């Protein structure tokens, strides 16, 4: 036994499932309009964006 | 045809302090990592390679700059940054707000450089998100070279010291400037010097003898405006090599190899992507240019 | 029979370059209605359909490459190829009316004459497309002297990938591609990519990561190295795939060919010939778009990579050392 003593610290992780309750009408939401943007046009394919 | 737009999501509302600097630079070029519409703020800065606690190495930062795509700002909304994109080869408006100010005109040439004069001026920190944003500097191609010319000379003469007026000052017609060297990592700036020791001593082996004899006929009496480097005295080495007789077909094989290795010195003195400006407005500070490929 | 001629009325008038945008001023602001492909944000609905976006797909960019037509001896160009190989136009002197010399990278491995262990795969394959190496050495008698003074990288003009090759007994026609994506002849609506043998290609960006930025571009580089084996001059051609930009890869290619620089230049402590100092050259074979996966293949075996969406843009030869 050497001169000093010592403490040891860990961490621990637990996969837990969770219950989320939310009261009524807590958030007012705004929903815009979807648009289409075409870009990165190549010779085998064309990429879009919505 | 093709669209170009990058809108940047941001997780916190910006302050009125930091928005006033971003409203000041509404036309500016900053590089960013990926090619998408949505983008995190941790790619917008140049400071992923140049942070405060990390010692910056401006050659490696400039080496970083040719990889990335470059982008121009459109608006600064108080939540989302909105940018437009630069692709080779596309004509686009560019507007210089860049603080160590130089003057451009129509039919000029440009380059993009890391900030080499004032980092605190050319970088703004965002205390709301904790991540800082670093702006590069756009420079005409003559001073685009001439700043890199001084920084390669500087790492040569900081290693010999193991004073400042000759090593840290970039010269130009009308103005002198101060390079920002307090903390520089020389190891990526010395591998460029490691290849310079390769090219330059090969060029000292295949030296044309007649073009050495030309200076022995020139600088002793014939004084010219651009030969004031030698100050009127021949170097001691040049008298030693000229003992051989001249012959034409020796130098014909030599001067082609002298020619072919100066093709290689493009690769070590490269800038970033270049910008050939065709039309520049003066009072509006706008311009028009096509982005060159790397 | 004019219904067959009515087909050419459709296809030729349908396939043209777009005409110049010229509207007289007396018509008014009708010219703004004649600008459709600059519009790039199309409206969407709750349930969009093709009939809502058949106008959106109609504007497409203008892409047409410029082909090359080569008339080759049937001995030099091996009669069977995987239809996407890379090419070279070697040129010495116009001696005939129209005869041309073309070099696949399997063929240039045979004129080289390097050791088997440098490329352990293609040596078996390139040994059965040709003879022992004198079937092609008869056409260039200066292959000893073109290596000494170092003029061989000045005589190659990189061409690109194949498109079509109609083969006869004595004369083989080769249709090559420049400026970009060559249209496939036999399969309609297909595109010929560039294929390299897996042995010749040397990747450059490879990390643990132990981060590099993305982009739109990655540039295939050609390389060609003068060296000496068995005290006889010989060449070595390697490829590179990197998007690091030209300022890095010249320093990166020096680290790949470190040993080749060292084993040669032990010789010149004794004899210093200025003609011998030239070492290698690097061309630019054109860009590749990002994140396209190179797909491995197998031919006869011979593993062969492939690059979809390849476009070609040839460059100069610059002498690195």
TrEMBL record, chain B:
One of its GO terms (cellular component) is viral capsid. Keywords: Capsid protein, Host nucleus, Virion. Pfam families: Herpes_V23 (PF01802). GO terms for molecular function: structural molecule activity. InterPro entries: Herpes_capsid_2 (IPR002690). It comes from the Viruses. This is Similar to Saimirine herpesvirus ORF 26 protein. The lineage of its organism: Viruses, Duplodnaviria, Heunggongvirae, Peploviricota, Herviviricetes.
UniProtKB/TrEMBL annotation, chain C:
Keywords: Capsid protein, Host nucleus, Virion. GO terms for molecular function: DNA binding. GO terms for cellular component: viral capsid. GO terms for biological process: viral capsid assembly. InterPro entries: Herpes_1 (IPR004999). This is Core gene UL38 family protein. The lineage of its organism: Viruses, Duplodnaviria, Heunggongvirae, Peploviricota, Herviviricetes. The gene is ORF62.
């Amino acid at each position: 036994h050497p001169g000093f003593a010592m403490t040891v610290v860990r961490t621990d992780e637990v996969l837990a499932e969770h219950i989320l309750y939310c009261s009524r009408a807590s958030t007012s939401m705004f929903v815009g309009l979807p648009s289409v943007v075409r870009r990165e046009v190549r010779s085998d394919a064309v990429t879009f964006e919505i | 045809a093709l669209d170009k737009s990058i809108v940047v999501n941001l997780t916190s509302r910006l302050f009125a302090d930091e928005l006033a600097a971003l409203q000041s630079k509404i036309g500016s070029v900053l590089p960013l990592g990926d090619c998408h519409r949505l983008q995190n703020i941790q790619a917008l800065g140049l400071g992923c390679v140049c942070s405060r606690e990390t010692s910056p190495d401006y050659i490696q930062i400039m080496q970083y700059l040719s990889k990335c795509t470059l982008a121009v700002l459109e608006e600064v909304r108080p939540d989302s940054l909105r940018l437009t994109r630069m692709d080779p080869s596309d004509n686009l408006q560019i507007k210089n707000v860049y603080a160590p100010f130089f003057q451009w005109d129509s039919n000029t040439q440009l380059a993009v450089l890391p900030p080499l004069f004032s980092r605190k001026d050319s970088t703004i920190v965002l205390e709301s998100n904790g991540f800082d944003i670093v702006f590069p500097m756009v420079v005409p191609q003559q001073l685009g070279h001439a700043i890199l010319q001084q920084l390669l000379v500087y790492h040569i003469y900081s290693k010999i010291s193991a004073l400042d007026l000759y090593t840290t000052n970039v010269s130009f017609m009308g103005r002198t400037y101060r390079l920002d060297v307090d903390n520089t990592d020389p190891r990526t700036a010395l591998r460029v010097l490691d290849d310079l020791s390769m090219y330059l001593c090969i060029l000292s082996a295949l030296v044309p003898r007649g073009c050495l004899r030309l200076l022995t006929a020139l600088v002793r009496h014939d004084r010219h405006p651009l030969t004031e480097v030698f100050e009127g005295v021949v170097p001691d080495e040049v008298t030693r090599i000229d003992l051989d007789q001249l012959s034409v077909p020796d130098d014909i094989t030599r001067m082609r190899v002298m020619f072919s290795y100066l093709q290689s010195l493009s690769s070590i003195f490269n800038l970033g992507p270049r910008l050939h400006v065709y039309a520049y407005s003066a009072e509006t500070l706008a311009a028009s240019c096509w982005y060159s490929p790397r | 029979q004019a219904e067959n001629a009515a087909r050419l009325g459709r296809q030729v008038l349908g396939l043209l370059p777009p005409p110049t945008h010229r509207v007289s001023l007396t018509r008014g602001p009708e010219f703004a209605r004649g600008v459709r492909d600059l519009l790039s944000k199309y409206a969407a609905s709750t349930r969009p359909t093709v009939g809502s976006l058949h106008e959106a797909l109609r504007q497409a960019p203008f892409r047409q490459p410029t082909y090359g037509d080569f008339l080759v001896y049937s001995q030099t160009f091996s009669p069977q190829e995987p239809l996407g190989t890379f090419l070279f136009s070697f040129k010495q002197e116009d001696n005939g009316s129209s005869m041309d010399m073309l070099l696949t990278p399997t063929s240039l491995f045979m004129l080289s004459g390097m050791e088997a262990a440098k490329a352990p795969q293609t040596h078996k394959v390139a040994g059965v497309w040709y003879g022992s190496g004198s079937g092609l050495a008869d056409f260039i008698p200066n292959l000893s002297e073109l290596m000494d003074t170092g003029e061989f990288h000045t005589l190659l003009t990189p061409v690109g990938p194949m498109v079509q090759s109609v083969h006869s007994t004595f004369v083989t026609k080769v249709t090559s591609a420049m400026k970009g994506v060559g249209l496939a002849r036999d399969e309609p609506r297909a595109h010929v990519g560039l294929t390299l043998p897996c042995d010749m290609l040397v990747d450059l960006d490879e990390s643990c990561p132990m981060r590099e930025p993305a982009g739109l571009n990655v540039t295939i580089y050609a390389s060609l190295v003068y060296l000496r084996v068995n005290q006889r001059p010989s060449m070595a051609l390697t490829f590179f795939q990197s998007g690091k930009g030209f300022a890095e890869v010249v320093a990166m290619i020096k680290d790949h060919f470190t040993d080749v620089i060292r084993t040669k230049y032990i010789q010149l402590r004794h004899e210093l010939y200025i003609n011998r100092l030239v070492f290698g050259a690097v061309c630019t074979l054109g860009t590749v778009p990002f994140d396209s996966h190179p797909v491995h293949q197998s031919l006869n075996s011979l593993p062969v990579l492939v690059f979809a969406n390849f476009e070609a843009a040839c460059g100069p030869w610059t002498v690195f050392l």
